[PDB]
Design a protein around this ligand. Sequence first.
Ligand code: HEM
Length: 408
Amino acid sequence: QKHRVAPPPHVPGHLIREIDAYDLDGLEQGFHEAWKRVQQPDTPPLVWTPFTGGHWIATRGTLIDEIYRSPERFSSRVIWVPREAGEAYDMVPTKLDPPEHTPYRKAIDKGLNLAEIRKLEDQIRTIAVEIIEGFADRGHCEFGSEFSTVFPVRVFLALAGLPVEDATKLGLLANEMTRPSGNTPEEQGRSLEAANKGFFEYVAPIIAARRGGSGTDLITRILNVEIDGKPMPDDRALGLVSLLLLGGLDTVVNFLGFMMIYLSRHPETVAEMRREPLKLQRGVEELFRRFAVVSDARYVVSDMEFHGTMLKEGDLILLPTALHGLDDRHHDDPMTVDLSRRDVTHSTFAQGPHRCAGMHLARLEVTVMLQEWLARIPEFRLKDRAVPIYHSGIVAAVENIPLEWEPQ
Ligand code: HEM
C-alpha cells in the first residue's frame, strides 16, 4: 500500500507526478531504464510527487547541474528524502554549506586528492588480480557475490586500515543509510537514524585511537588535519569518518554491477576496450556518465521561481543523477556506451563544492578493474535468461549477475 501526502497550496495539479524513488515504476527492467521513463519528451523540468513525504524531482540534466552548483539557493541542510531521514542524517561534510563545509572538504582532500590516490594503484591492482584469479579459469561466476561486493570493499578497508571482517556489518549499515526500510516517511526516518548511529558507534573507538596517532592509513591522515588551528571536534569527526566509510563501500560496488551488466550484453564494446587499451582508459568517464547511482536532494533556501516553477522555502528537490548523464538533450543516444564520445558531461559525481571527493579513487578502481578483468577474461556474457534484480533509493543497487565465458 502506497503512502501519499497532499500537495501544498503552491504545487499546481499539472506538475504532480506519481514517482516513488524507493521503488520506481518499471524498476524490474533496470534502475537507469526506470528513471528514464520519468524523462519523457514533454515532461516539466520540475515535477512533484506525493510519495516519500512529498518532494520535487528535477527531470533534466541542466537543473541537476545548476542546483548542485548553487549552495546559496539550494542548501545541504537536508539531502535525503523523506524529510525525516534527511533530518536524521548526520555525515560530514555533506550536511554542511560553504563556508563551514570548506575546511572539512580540505581535510578530506589531503587523503583523497589525485596525487595521493595514484599511489594506491598497485595495491588496488593486486587486490583485483587475486580476486579475479579465483575464478577466471572456471568459465562462470556470480559477478555481484564474487566480485563487485568484494573488490571495492577490500580496497577501501585496506586503505582505511580496517579489518576485512568488518565488511558485513558496514554493508548492512550502508544499506539502511541509502535504502532505508519502511513504507512510511517516519519508518524510513527511524531506519536511517538507527543505521547512522550504528556508523557513529563503529567509528568512535577508531577516532579515539587514531587522534594524534600514529599511523598512516586514510583515517588517521584525514582526522589529524586541523580545523581553524585546532583538532577536529568529536561531533564532526564521527560524521566525517562515517561518510568516508559510506562513500568508500556502497557506491563503487553498485556502479560496477550496472556497468558489467551492460558490458556482458555488448561484446563489440568489450572488444574495442581489448583492441585499444587507450580507449578503455579514456572511456572510463563515459562509463560514469552512463551508470549514475546517486539520487539525493537539496533544501530550497528561500521562496523563489526556478525554471518557471514556484518553490517554497524548505521544499526538497530530488536530483536523480542518472537524469543528467542520460538526458537526451545532453547526449545523443544516451543509453549507448560510446567510448569515443567527446562530451561526457554528467553529474554522477554531482557538481559544486560537494562534487565527489572520492572521484579519483572511483575512477582508478574502475580502470584497474577493467584492465585486470579483460586481461584474464577477455570475453563474457550474461547467463541465458538471467534476470538481475534491482533496487532504487538514494543509492541504486543490483544483484544477481551470472557471467559465463570460455576460459582462455
Ligand atoms: C561510483 C562511485 C561514486 C559515486 C557515483 C559517488 C557519488 C558522490 C556524490 C553524488 C556526491 C555528492 C553528494 C552530495 O553532496 O549531495 C559524493 C560526495 C562524496 N563522496 Fe563520492 N561517490 C563515489 C565514490 C566515492 C568514493 C570511493 C569515496 C571514498 C571515500 C567517496 C567519497 C565521497 C565523499 C567524502 C563525499 C563528500 C564530498 C563533500 O561533501 O565535499 N565517493 N559522492
